[PDB]
Amino acid sequence: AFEQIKKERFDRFNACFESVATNIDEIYKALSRNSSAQAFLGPENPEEPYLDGINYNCVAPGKRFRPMDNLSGGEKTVAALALLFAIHSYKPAPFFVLDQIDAALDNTNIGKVANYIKEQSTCNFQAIVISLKEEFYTKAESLIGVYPEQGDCVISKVLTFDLTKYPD
C-alpha cells in the first residue's frame, strides 16, 4: 500500500516536473534572443522528489556562473518571466495579469520582452498589463486610460482608445 501511494505521487510529480524543466530551458534560450544562456531547474533527493527543495540556477547572458542572490534584479526579472511563461506552457492558462514588471529593466530589455510578448500573444493566451513606459504598450493595439476625479473621495473612471489605424 505504501508502494502504491508513493508510485502515485512520484508519477504525477515527475511527469509534470520534467516537462517543465525541458520547456524552461528552451524558453529562456529563446527569450534572451542570444544563444549563451542556460537555466536548470533541478530537484533534490531524486528518489522521493515530492518532499525536498527544487532548486533553480540560471546563467546571465554574458558572465560567469554565480549564485542566484548575487545576480542583479534586471536579470532576475527576466528569469522570473521565463519561469512564469514555462509554467503556463506546461498546462495552458487563458490569460496573464502583468503589473509593472518594468521596475528595473532597461528600455532595450523591455523592447525585446515586448517583441516576445507580441509574437506569443496571438494564438496562445490573452495578456493584460499595467505599466508606465510607453515602449511596452506600443506593440499593443488598444489602450485603456484610467483617470481619477477630485471629490469627497477620489472617484475614478475609465475610457478606451483604438490604435489599429496608424503606421508602424
Binding site: 534584479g73 534586471g74 532597461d106
Partner: protein, 195 residues
Amino acid sequence: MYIKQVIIQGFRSYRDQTIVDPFSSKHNVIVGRNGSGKSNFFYAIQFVLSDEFSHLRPEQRLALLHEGTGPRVISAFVEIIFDNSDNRLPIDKEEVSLRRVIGAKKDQYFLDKKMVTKNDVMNLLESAGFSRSNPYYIVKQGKINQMATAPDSQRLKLLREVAGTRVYDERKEESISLMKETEGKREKINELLKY
C-alpha cells in the same frame, strides 16, 4: 562630510580602480546600461562605513571576492578619502584616508597607516554622526516601500535613533545589572563587618 573620492581594488567587479576626477558638492548623478555594476559601487561605499553588510557567513564572504580571470586574488582592499574641513570628524587633516583590507581571515581598517582595534572606529563614526547598524540613509533598489508599511514601532525606533539616544539607553541598562551585583556585594560586606 564631503566624499572627495574612492579607490577600489578587487572587490566585486572593480579589479583595479586608480584615481578618478573628484566629486562635486551638489549633485552627481550616475547612469549606466542594465547590468553594468553601479549598485555594487554603493555596496562598496556602505561595506566600508556600515558594519551590517559584512555580517554574512564565510561562504558568502568568499563569494564576495571578485574572481574573473588569471590568478585569484585573496586580499581585496578599498580606500576612501574625504575632507573634514568643518572638523566634524575630530582628528585634524585636510584629506582623511581610511581603508578596509578584506581577506578570508583578515579584516583591517588602516587610518593613516596606523593600526586600530575595530571598536574605536565604530565609536568614532557614531560620535561623528554616522550610524553603523542603521539601514536608514542608504536605500537599496526596491526597499523604499517598506518604510511605509512598516509597523509604527520601527519608525519610533528610527526617529529615536535620529535623536541620538541609543548609546545612553544601552549603557544605562548594562550598568544597572553590575550595580545591582555591587548591592549584593555590599550586603556581603556588612555581614563580614558585623562578624
